[PDB]
Amino acid sequence: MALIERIGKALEPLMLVMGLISPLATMPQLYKLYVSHSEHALGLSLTTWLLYSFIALLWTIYGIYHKNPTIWVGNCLGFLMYVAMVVGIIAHTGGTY
Amino acid sequence: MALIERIGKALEPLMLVMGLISPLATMPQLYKLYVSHSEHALGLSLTTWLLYSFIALLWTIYGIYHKNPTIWVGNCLGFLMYVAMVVGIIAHTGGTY
Ligand SMILES: CCCCCCCC/C=C/CCCCCCCC(=O)OC[C@H](O)CO
Ligand SMILES: CCCCCCCC/C=C/CCCCCCCC(=O)OC[C@H](O)CO
Ligand SMILES: CCCCCCCC/C=C/CCCCCCCC(=O)OC[C@H](O)CO
Ligand SMILES: CCCCCCCC/C=C/CCCCCCCC(=O)OC[C@H](O)CO
Ligand SMILES: CCCCCCCC/C=C/CCCCCCCC(=O)OC[C@H](O)CO
Ligand SMILES: CCCCCCCC/C=C/CCCCCCCC(=O)OC[C@H](O)CO
Ligand SMILES: CCCCCCCCCCCCCCC
Ligand SMILES: CCCCCCCCCCCCCCC
C-alpha cells in the first residue's frame, strides 16, 4: 500500500500543525454563528459543541501533563473555539440541544 | 499539579474511546441538519466541515498505516460523520462557505 505509506510518512513532521487545522477551520463557523447568520443558530447543536469542548479540554490536559505540544497546542486552541461556539449558540437561541 | 496528573493518567486506557466521542457527538448536529432544523442549514459553515473531513481522513490514513486503532477508529467514524455534514449542507443550501 504505497499511497497509504506515502501519506502516513509525510504527515509525521506535520502532526502539530495538523492539530491546528480543525480549530482554525472553526473560524468560518464562528463567523456564521456570531456575525453573518446568527438567525440560523438554532440549526447548531449545543450538545455537539459542548462535547467537542469537553474532549478538547481532556486532550489539552493530557498533552500538558506529558509535555507533548503536538497534542495540547491544537487541542487548547480547539477548546477555546468550541467553547466560543457553545457560548454563541446559547446567546442566540436561549438554549437548545 | 496533582489534578492534571490524575486526569492525564486516568485517560490513558480510554484514549480509543475518547476518539469516538466527538464523532458520536456529531449525531445531534446531523439530526438538526437533516431532520429537525434543515431550514437553518445556512448557519453551518461548509468550509469548516470540509476541513474537518479532510483532517479526519488524514489521521485515519496515518492510524491505518501505523496499525494504531486508537487513532484511526475514531477518526474513521469522524470522517464519515463530517462528510455527512458536508453533503447535508450542500443539499439544503445549494452551496455556501
Ligand atoms: C474565542 C475565539 C473567537 C475568535 C475566532 C472567531 C473568528 C470569527 C471570524 C472568522 C473569520 C473567518 C471567516 C471570514 C469572514 C470574512 C468577513 C468579510 O470579509 O466579509 C464577509 C465575507 O464576504 C464572507 O462572505
Ligand atoms: C468577557 C469576554 C472574555 C472572554 C474570555 C473567556 C475565556 C475563555 C475562552 C472562551 C472563548 C469564547 C468566549 C466567548 C466570547 C464572547 C462572545 C459573546 O458572548 O457574544 C454574545 C453575543 O454577542 C451577545 O448576544
Ligand atoms: C466542560 C467543557 C464545557 C464548558 C462550557 C463553557 C461554557 C459554559 C456556558 C456559558 C454560557 C454563557 C453565555 C451567555 C449568553 C449571554 C446571555 C444571553 O444572551 O442569553 C443566554 C441565557 O443565559 C440563556 O441561558
Ligand atoms: C453517515 C452518518 C449518518 C448517520 C448519523 C446521523 C444521526 C442523525 C440522528 C442522530 C440522533 C441524535 C439526536 C436524537 C434525535 C431524537 C429524535 C426524537 O426522539 O425526536 C426528537 C427529539 O424530541 C428531539 O427534541
Ligand atoms: C446513496 C447513499 C450511500 C451512502 C454511502 C456513502 C459512503 C461515504 C460515507 C458518507 C457518509 C454520508 C453520506 C451522505 C448521506 C446521504 C444524505 C443525503 O444525501 O440526503 C440529502 C437530502 O436528504 C436531500 O435533500
Ligand atoms: C477530502 C475530504 C472531503 C470530501 C468531501 C466529500 C463530499 C463531496 C461533496 C458531495 C456533494 C453531494 C451532495 C448532493 C446534494 C444533493 C443535490 C442537491 O440537493 O443540490 C446540491 C447541488 O449539487 C449543489 O451543488
Ligand atoms: C457519546 C455522545 C453522544 C451524544 C448524544 C446525546 C444527544 C442527546 C442530548 C443529551 C445530551 C445533552 C447534554 C450535553 C452534553
Ligand atoms: C486553516 C484553515 C482556515 C480556514 C479559513 C478559510 C475560510 C474562507 C473560506 C475559503 C476556503 C473554502 C474552501 C473549503 C476548504
UniProtKB/Swiss-Prot annotation, chains A, B:
The keyword Transmembrane helix applies. Its main location: membrane. The chain crosses the membrane at residues 15-35, 44-65, 71-91. Residues 4-70 form the PQ-loop domain. Keywords: Cell membrane, Membrane, Sugar transport, Transmembrane, Transmembrane helix, Transport. GO terms for molecular function: identical protein binding. It is found in: Cell membrane. GO terms for cellular component: membrane; plasma membrane. It comes from the Bacteria. It is a multi-pass membrane protein. Homodimer. The homodimer mediates transmembrane sugar transport down a concentration gradient. Transport is probably effected by rocking-type movements, where a cargo-binding cavity opens first on one and then on the other side of the membrane. This is Sugar transporter SemiSWEET.
